[PDB]
């Protein structure tokens, strides 16, 4: 669930763009992200539309740290 939320969130920050999220995701390839998008477009189209109208910024720093903290939290809680 968390990974899906973050895939969405990055799709809003880095757009419908996959190689960079694969790069920042420790263990995801671009084909993986493309497949996530195929699977999710059928149901979450409205959220992906929410992904292209707000101008909140993107980073490595604030984000890289946010990724690592939420992944550690999820792994310790899962």
């Amino acid at each position: 669930n968390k990974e899906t939320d973050m895939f969405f969130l990055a799709i809003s920050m880095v757009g419908t763009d996959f190689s960079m999220i694969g790069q920042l995701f420790p263990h995801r390839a671009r084909i993986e992200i493309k497949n996530k998008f195929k699977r999710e477009e059928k149901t979450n189209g409205w959220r992906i539309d929410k992904a292209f109208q707000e101008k909140r910024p993107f980073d490595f720093d604030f984000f890289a740290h946010l990724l690592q903290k939420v992944l550690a939290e999820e792994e310790k809680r899962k």
């Binding site: 809003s12 920050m13 880095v14 757009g15 419908t16 763009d17 996959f18 190689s19 960079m20 790069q23 189209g45 992906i48 539309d49 292209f52 101008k55 993107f58």
Partner: protein, 178 residues
Amino acid sequence: GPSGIVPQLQNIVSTVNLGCKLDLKTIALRARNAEYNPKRFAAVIMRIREPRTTALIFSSGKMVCTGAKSEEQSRLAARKYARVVQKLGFPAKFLDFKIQNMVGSCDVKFPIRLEGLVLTHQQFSSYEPELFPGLIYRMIKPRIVLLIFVSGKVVLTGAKVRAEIYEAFENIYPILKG
């Protein structure tokens, strides 16, 4: 005559010249939508949903876009990326828009025995059931390449307008029937 089923277009391919130099690293730094993986390839690939399309940009100032269901939709998406690049801080222009390719598909709702087609059409139809399950046919008028399957569904590609797809469809339809 027509069987009552129209060929629906599945894809559109188009390109336009941006007319200026761009820095891919700058785009990846600023735009909320960008790649730059020079270790694999030095380019930036876009995509938007309205229209549903994917575009790709270079430092050389060219754009290639694809994914729409209609040519006008493809042009709309192209102009959207042109607007994005213009507001990215680049002096982009929407110059020399050209449509490259489109894909369509249809069906005939009756089974297709590929063996007869290859036996009567081998000179332009290539049948090889070992690697590619379907049958390959290349058409001259217009320059269309066609894929045919037992289920009766057909994939059409290589055109520039939907009229070519329809005309090739009705050219082949009597052959498909018998």
